[PDB]
Amino acid sequence: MIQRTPKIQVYSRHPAENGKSNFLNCYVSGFHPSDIEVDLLKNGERIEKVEHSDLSFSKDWSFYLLYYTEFTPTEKDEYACRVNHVTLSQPKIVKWDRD
Amino acid sequence: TVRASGHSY
Amino acid sequence: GSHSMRYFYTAMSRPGRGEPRFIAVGYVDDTQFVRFDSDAASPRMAPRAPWIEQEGPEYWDRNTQISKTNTQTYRESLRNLRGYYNQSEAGSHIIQRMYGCDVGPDGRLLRGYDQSAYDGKDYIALNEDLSSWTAADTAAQITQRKWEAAREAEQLRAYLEGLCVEWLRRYLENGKETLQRADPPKTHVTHHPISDHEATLRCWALGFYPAEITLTWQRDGEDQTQDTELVETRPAGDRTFQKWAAVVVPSGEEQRYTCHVQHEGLPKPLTLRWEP
Ligand code: NA
Known about the structure:
The structure holds 3 protein chains of 3 kinds.
Chain A: E1 7-12, E2 22-31, E3 37-42, E4 45-46, E5 51-52, E6 56-57, E7 63-71, E8 79-84, E9 92-95
Antiparallel strand pairs in A: 1-2, 2-7, 3-4, 3-8, 5-7, 6-7, 8-9
Chain B: no helix or strand
Chain C: E1 3-12, E2 21-28, E3 31-37, E4 46-47, H1 57-84, E5 94-103, E6 109-118, E7 121-126, E8 133-135, H2 138-149, H3 152-161, H4 163-174, H5 176-179, E9 186-193, E10 198-208, E11 214-219, E12 222-223, E13 229-230, E14 234-235, E15 241-250, E16 257-262, E17 270-272
Antiparallel strand pairs in C: 1-2, 1-5, 2-3, 3-4, 5-6, 6-7, 7-8, 9-10, 10-15, 11-12, 11-16, 13-15, 14-15, 16-17
Helix pairs in contact in C: 3-4
Sodium ion binds at residues 84-86, 88 of chain A.
C-alpha cells in the first residue's frame, strides 16, 4: 500500500494589512490516505472556530482540504499551520509568510 | 443529481 | 464555454472504529454544490451552493435515499475488495469513485466518465465508449464480471447521456450569474533579492475563476519551464483561486524576463514584467 504526504500552503484570502479583517487559509493537498489533523496556530496556540471544506480529491486520487478561520493580522501576531498525517514522523509546522 | 445506486464491487 | 458535472465518492473502512464512512460531494466545474456524509448526526444530501437551494423536497429525498443506499453498497464493496486482495481485517482501506459528464457550449455531451480507485491506485474505469471496462488487475476483473452480468455499463451510459447532461444544463441556467461567469486574475510581479548575484521574480494571479490558468516565465522570449517554480493552484475561500510562478534571475537581467498569463476571464492573454 502506497501513501502520499500532504503539501501545505498557508496564506490569506485577501492581501494582508494590519488591522483589517481577513481569512487565514491552510490548504493541504496531494495526500493519501484521507485522515489528517490540521490546526491553525496564533503564536503557537491552537485556534478554535476553525472550519474546513468537504473532503474531495484530485484526478490523481489524492485528497485536498481547505482549513480556514476569520482573523485580523497585526505586526506582532505570528500565525502558522500544524499538520499531522500517517506519513509524518511528527507534526509539520508551516508559518504564515507574508510577502 | 446523483446517479441511481448501482451494483456492489 | 464547456462545462462539467462530477460526483466524488470516498468510502473508507476503519476496523475497530465502527462501520466504513461514505462521503459524496457534487461539483459543477470548480463549484461544489452538494455534500453527503454518513457520519452526520442525520445524514442527508445537503446544499453547498445557493442556486441548488431552490430544488424541491423530491430532489433532496431522492439524492438522500440513493446516498444512504450507497453507504451500504460501499461497505459491502469494501468487504468484497478486501477479499479480492486477501487482505487482513485489521487494515483500513479506501474506495474512491469519480463520475460525470462534460458538455460543450451548446450543452451537447462531449464525454462521460466513471472511474474507481482502491487505496489510491486505479481499479476499474468505464471506457470512453460508455460500453466497455478497463480493469487494472485480476481483482478488478472480478468486479468487471459482476458488472457485465448486471449490465452496469448500460445503466451508467443511460445516466451520463441522460440525467447528467440534463441536470447539468439546469444547474448552469439556475446558477448562470456565477457558473457562466469567468473572473480574470488580478496579477502583479514581486521582486525578492536572494543575494548580490540573484533575485526571485514571482508572478502572481489572484481572484480568478475557474481554476484553470497558465502562468509562464520567458527569458528573451523562451519559456523557462525547467527553471520555473509553479505553486499548486489554491482556493481562496470565496470561490476564487490563487497561483504564482517564480524564477531565479541574475541581478540586472530582470527586464529580460516576462510573465505570461492565460485565463478564460481575460479578453487577451497578459504579458507582465517587473516594474521597479
Ligand atoms: Na504522524
